[PDB]
UniProtKB/TrEMBL annotation, chain B:
The chain crosses the membrane at residues 27-49, 80-99, 136-161, 173-191, 197-215, 236-259, 265-288. This is V-type ATP synthase subunit I. It comes from the Bacteria. Belongs to the V-ATPase 116 kDa subunit family. It comes from Thermus thermophilus (strain ATCC 27634 / DSM 579 / HB8). The lineage of its organism: Bacteria, Thermotogati, Deinococcota, Deinococci, Thermales. It is found in: Membrane.
UniProtKB/TrEMBL annotation, chains C, D, E, F, G, H, J, K, L, M:
Keywords: Ion transport, Membrane, Signal, Transmembrane, Transmembrane helix, Transport. It comes from the Bacteria. It is found in: Membrane. One of its GO terms (molecular function) is proton-transporting ATPase activity, rotational mechanism. The chain crosses the membrane at residues 9-28, 49-69. Belongs to the V-ATPase proteolipid subunit family. One of its GO terms (cellular component) is proton-transporting V-type ATPase, V0 domain. It is a multi-pass membrane protein. The chain holds residues 27 to 99 of 99 of the full protein. Residues 11-69 form the V-ATPase proteolipid subunit C-like domain. This is V-type ATP synthase, subunit K.
From TrEMBL, chain I:
It comes from Thermus thermophilus (strain ATCC 27634 / DSM 579 / HB8). It is found in: Membrane. The chain crosses the membrane at residues 10-29, 50-70. The keyword Membrane applies. The chain holds residues 26 to 99 of 99 of the full protein. This is V-type ATP synthase, subunit K. It comes from the Bacteria.
């Protein structure tokens, strides 16, 4: 059963590339958020709205990695 | 010798008391140029262009190039022509040294003398062999750089001898010691591994190098020794360019031969014209850079390095 | 040699990861809507988030094209 | 068997993935450009979304390239 | 024979996807730069569309080289 | 046996390294603006630190798969 | 015989796609300047189109080498 | 067989390398910001240091996984 | 072909030509953008921009020809 | 003798030179600002040069793991 | 012949191609700066021509290595 | 396994290769600022070039690893 | 000597290619600043050229390793 190792490398690269995807989107939004908080500290809730939208992308990869584990 | 002084004159003026570097170039640069010159058939066109410019000279043409809006000076061009005489000479003799030219009939009959075909026309380099041709290609360009850099460091040291900046005279021979030590180590490593006099050479090399360090802990001098120890190895680029040009010309001539004969009766009368067109266009593209490469090598590694960072008047 | 599953699963893994990277690089530069909203008109939040919610269609596309690979088994 | 056909999932998956990231790169820049129009004018909003929803012909083409080899499977 | 009949389809993924992100970055810069004219004039929409709809030739190449040997098997 | 044990390790290592570099990329650009904000006043210290503690979720997500995998080993 | 068709296939595919990517990344930069150039007058229209025309020669070489290596089959 | 004991060696390697690269790209921007801000005011040297001494913490996981992976021999 | 020599040399040729083409395009990008910016008023001297855009073309050709000849001679 | 004994060597570079990439990209950003600060004021030589070296903690880890893996030979 | 005689060829190709990459990336910035300098003072054309092609040596090493490797055939 | 000493070659070359640009990226950004500094004060060449010699130190690691790997054969 | 020579061969080209890239990445940014300096002042050819010749100290590597290992083979 050598495919039992190929599933591991596949899920690892999947979750890693998902981490790259969610880790690159913070560029403009972080600067915008800190600039708005410096502009107005009352903008906590509005700022934190944007900072959670791309972070859900990792969920799909970890779900598919988890469900492909059970194929063994 | 006097015409070559123009190229140096573009740079900063020397200081009186420092030796004139102009007589170095006219003997060393032109045969370096000769190594790109398997192309000898097309350098007769360069001779024709020199004839054309000499016709301008006897006309005393104050030429203006419409493309670049530049002005030309008639008395300058005669210096250029007398400069180009020697590179045309080195052109011819180096193309003879190659031995192989486009009229080599070995693709059809064993007329030219080669190891493949023991003919009556001996060709020194067939450009196919890679066993000893490679080593012979390396060795001379290795040696030329070593000789010139040793001459440069020696003359810089002798300039340091006169005035009491002689503190850097010691580091000048320290460079020599470091270079001979690393050369001995390298030759002992990949060579036939005999090491006795090699060990003596490297011992004396790093010893006399470490002697120069005891003059003063100069923080700036210690890393750049490795840099010029690669600049000496940078001299190997000369045969690279020449091999690139020569093998390209040879393969393009073989393409002309293939389109001539290997297409059968239908291709006999066609291939040579387009082969010559390709040759001339690639030469037009390439020869400018191939010309400026060795002159800039000697111009920045020897000429600028020994004495042309300092004052001027 | 009956190996079939793993050399499918590696492609299954990389497809969704590359799609996630695409959505990330899409979302990276569109953050100017937030500062463009709060600094000038906070009421434009919907007109901002409509652009936010569109680019993630491609990973939704990538979900089923990876799911079908497991369904072959 | 198996090894003769399991490798195809890599080829289509990578294709749809980097097509997705290419269209994400396109969408990011054009959306960053497109926000300024709606930010300063609510009227030209309509043409902006037309300009935003152009670069999608490549991903459906990748879908078709996946589907033809799925049919060949 | 063998899995060489499966290895031929691997190049389809590269051929599609590389042209895909090529046009991705192409219209990424072009269409984002193109909206300057529509920010000031409605009439210049045609020429901007001409700029952003010219360079797609690369993906048609990937399509045709996909069709050129997929029928080998 | 054999020819199985290295694959799990290299996959987990690739995953965690990719996650770590993604976290680094996320922190890099926000850090400069945080430096500017805390250079404005000391009062922005906590409100700048609250942003930087977010992306570490990726690393803890990546590493947990190694434990179950080498427990399977 | 017939054990290396996939290798030449993927080689030509990567060649032509990589040439396409290079042409696209050149086209993005040239078109960004060209679309701003047309914003002043129509007199620069044809003189700008030649600059975007020239890099198309690169994919022609890849198509040529692929097609001449397609004849190996 | 037995080459799995050699195949695990790369697994530590790419992980620690990618972690180091992510660390470095994290330190780059924050250190540039810190040295830029600290020139105009040196009083904030402690705050700048305790700020930019932060994303290097991901390295401790790379050495941890390195030691626990090769310890399996 | 005991070994898969044709594919092995073909993938190397493809890598060579693709990387050469992308490098030439990367070189061409900035110089073309700057030349287009220049010729907004340089119709008098646009030929300099033409010849400066022409010179990076030399980068493709040597890789192309070596890729051609390493397979065409066998 | 298995293939592992020669397989050990390939893992070293992927760690050490990639950490070298991280250190270089970290140094590049800070060096310009540092030399600018020195040009405007030589008195800041110490407080700048203390930041000129620091990411090289990564490369010593890389050499450490590289040699300690070579010890298994 | 043999498998090595084909396997050798990939190293030469990648070497020369990525050397061409280096030459092009070096060429772009210096060419753009040179034509920026020549835009308002055309007299300096005979000066910039030295610098804008000086790094051409890079590919020459690659083709030298290529001639070395094909000499082992 | 007689192929063990065959793959030791690739590790040395890859190591020195990626270490090369990992070095070069530092000089890339520091050199422009250094020559900007020398453009207005000619006594600053000494304090500039010392920065240009800092990233040269770590190229030695790949070649020494290569030499000690050559010590095996 | 079996079918191994291709493995030794491929590692040579990667080193020299990436050395060329490391030279070019520095050369691109340094040359632009140098020619910008020389455009406004004729009095700086030497100080610029000595710094432009500095990155050429990197390309000397790789090639000598290739020579000595080919001689070893």
């Amino acid at each position: 059963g050598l495919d039992r190792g190929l599933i591991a490398v596949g899920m690892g690269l999947a979750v890693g590339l998902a981490a790259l995807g969610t880790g690159v989107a913070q560029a403009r939004i972080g600067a915008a958020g800190v600039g708005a908080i410096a502009e107005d500290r009352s903008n906590f809730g509005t700022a934190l709205i944007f900072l959670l939208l791309p972070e859900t992308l990792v969920i799909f990869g970890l779900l598919i990695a988890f469900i492909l584990n059970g194929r063994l | 010798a006097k015409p070559f002084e123009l190229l140096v004159s573009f740079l900063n003026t020397p200081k009186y008391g420092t030796f004139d570097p102009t007589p170095v170039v006219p003997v060393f640069f032109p045969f370096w140029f000769g190594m790109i010159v398997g192309d000898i058939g097309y350098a007769l066109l360069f001779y024709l262009v020199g004839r054309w410019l000499s016709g301008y000279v006897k006309r005393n043409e104050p030429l203006v190039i419409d493309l670049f809006a530049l002005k030309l000076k008639p008395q300058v061009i005669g210096k250029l022509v007398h400069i180009l005489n020697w590179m045309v000479f080195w052109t011819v003799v180096w193309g003879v040294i190659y031995g192989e030219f486009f009229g080599t009939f070995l693709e059809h009959l064993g007329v030219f003398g080669t190891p493949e075909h023991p003919g009556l026309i001996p060709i020194l380099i067939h450009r196919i062999d890679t066993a000893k041709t490679a080593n012979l290609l390396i060795l001379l360009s290795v040696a030329f750089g070593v000789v010139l850099v040793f001459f440069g460091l020696a003359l810089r040291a002798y300039l340091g001898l006169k005035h009491r900046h002689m503190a850097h005279f010691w580091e000048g021979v320290g460079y020599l010691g470091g270079l001979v030590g690393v050369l001995a180590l390298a030759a002992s490593y990949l060579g036939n591994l005999q090491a006795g006099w090699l060990q003596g050479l490297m011992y004396l090399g790093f010893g006399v190098f470490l002697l120069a360090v005891l003059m003063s802990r100069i923080w700036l001098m210690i890393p750049e020794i490795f840099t010029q120890a690669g600049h000496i190895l940078s001299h190997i680029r000369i045969y690279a360019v020449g091999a690139a040009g020569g093998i390209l010309a040879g393969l393009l001539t073989d393409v002309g031969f293939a389109l001539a004969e290997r297409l059968g009766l239908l291709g006999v009368l066609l291939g040579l014209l387009v082969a010559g067109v390709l040759h001339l266009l690639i030469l037009l593209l390439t020869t400018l850079g191939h010309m400026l490469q060795p002159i800039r090598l000697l111009w920045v590694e020897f000429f600028t390095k020994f004495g042309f960072y300092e004052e001027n008047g």
